[PDB]
Amino acid sequence: MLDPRLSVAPMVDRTDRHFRFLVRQVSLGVRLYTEMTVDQAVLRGNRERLLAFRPEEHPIALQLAGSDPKSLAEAARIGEAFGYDEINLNLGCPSEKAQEGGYGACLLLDLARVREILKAMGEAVRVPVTVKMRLGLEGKETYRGLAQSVEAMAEAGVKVFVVHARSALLALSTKANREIPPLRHDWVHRLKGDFPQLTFVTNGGIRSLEEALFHLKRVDGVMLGRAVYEDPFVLEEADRRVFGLPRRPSRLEVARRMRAYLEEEVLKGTPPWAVLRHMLNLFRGRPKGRLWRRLLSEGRSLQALDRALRLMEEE
RNA sequence: GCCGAGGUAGCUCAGUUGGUAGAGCAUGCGACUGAAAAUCGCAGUGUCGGCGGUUCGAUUCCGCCCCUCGGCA
Ligand SMILES: Cc1cc2nc3c(=O)[nH]c(=O)nc-3n(C[C@H](O)[C@H](O)[C@H](O)COP(=O)(O)O)c2cc1C
């Protein structure tokens, strides 16, 4: 039993184990997702570097990308061992890299392939195998086509469908595919109405917790990506209102704990910028936030963070 | 001439071991205590130096070519 009500979207070059730990200091309940991790990188690459994460990041789900059923079943078997509570399948990445590899959003073209992929992964691991998909391809999406492909996946085992509510135009850039196609959140709402036994987590364009709450009164969950990264404290009230916990974090308290987390990591071989480049938005839209962001991007050291914290305390 | 170590936004630069490329300062527009300081948001644009090599595909790895650099000659 997992809590799908709220989560931070998987974002390449964003949601590494460092930023995930940061978000965990802001919200205890919010579900975290790893970056898209290709199956071949899990099978042949340094597995400790890729998948190893901290136990504080629980709950956390490893998202895998691929096309070969046997390769994704082996990659899901490996992810489960590292302790991931969930193995999510990437069916939305419209990059040129994805199209050439035949994985991501272009996998939606072939339900027969996607269904044998899901059957293999689900039987290879005991953790819930989910999916993060898009509404369709080349703006040719129909509601009966999306509901029909969701039916097939559900018969393959899938229970949770994290839906990025917008089509993927393979011709456009990746940054263009997250701003141009129309957001049909109402399509996901109807997916819950046609499939009340399934869990749907709508996603796309959610700017605040107030908007996320609106969508929660219609579907099971909401996923925020750029809203969280651009300013982690967009989930400031997430715990208290969504997860019903009695705790509201302070931007300064979180900075104090992120400093101690930076001391452990740096002191055991972690480059200081690997942790500091994700703390720049901690004071976004706050007094003297500029100087906080300047100090860390210039110094890039524990000592620099100590002087930046001291200033924030003075202010 | 042997070599250290580099070519990424205008700028000083990150990118840790092939997989949805971006930090800072500075340009530009904007919010605000009254113009105004202080303060903050918004967006920006990439042939990741050119040529082949592997690959599903490499800013990332090979060889070649190639501009500023530093000790040795
Ligand atoms: C920088 C960036 C990287 C992303 N990488 C992934 C990814 O690796 N896997 C994935 O399923 N979605 C990825 N996405 C898409 C997000 O998961 C999400 O669907 C999209 O940002 C829209 O949701 P949002 O408006 O709440 O951010 C990425 C988005 C961004 C902005």
Length A186 CA → B60 C1' (Å)? 41
Cβ(A60)–Cβ(A30) below 8 Å:
no
The kind and range of the H/E element at A193 are helix A185-194
Computed over its alpha carbons, how large is the radius of gyration of chain A?
Answer: 20
Residue A36 Cα to ligand 1 midpoint, Å, equals 9
Q: Could you give the residue range(s) of every CATH 1.20.120.1460 domain in chain A?
A: 244-315
- Residue A51, number of CB atoms within 10 A of its CB: 21
Ligand 1 atom, smallest distance to A35 CA:
8
Q: Is A204 annotated as a binding residue?
A: yes
Cβ(A248)–Cβ(A236) below 8 Å:
yes
Distances (CA, A) of A315 to A26, A80, A255, A291, A311: 21, 45, 14, 12, 6
- Contacts for A109-118 with beta carbons within 8 Å, 24 or more apart? A109/A137, A111/A149, A111/A152, A113/A67, A113/A69, A114/A149, A114/A152, A114/A153, A114/A156, A115/A152, A115/A153, A115/A155, A115/A156, A116/A69, A117/A66, A117/A67, A117/A69, A117/A72, A117/A89, A118/A89, A118/A153, A118/A156, A118/A157, A118/A158
Q: Is A106 a catalytic residue?
A: no
Distances (CA, A) of A138 to A94, A134, A183: 11, 11, 14
Question: Minimal CA–CA distance to A258: which of A306, A225, A295, A290?
Answer: A306
CATH level 2 (architecture), domain A2-243: Alpha-Beta Barrel (3.20)
Q: Which nucleotide is nearest to A50 (CA to C1')?
A: B17
Kindly state the tokens that stand for A244.
């019903």
Resolution (angstroms) equals 3.5
Length A290 CA → B42 C1' (Å)? 14
Q: Could you give the residue range(s) of every CATH 3.20.20.70 domain in chain A?
A: 2-243
Annotated catalytic residue: which of A93, A168, A222, A305?
A: A93
Whether nucleic acid strand B comes within 7 Å of the CB of A94, the answer is yes
- Rounded distance between C-alpha atoms, residue A87 and residue A51, angstroms: 12
The residue whose CA lies nearest the C1' of nucleotide B18 is A41
Question: How was this entry determined?
Answer: X-ray
Question: Which numeric CATH code is attached to A244-315?
Answer: 1.20.120.1460
- Residue A112, number of CB atoms within 10 A of its CB: 8
- Rounded distance between C-alpha atoms, residue A38 and residue A67, angstroms: 10
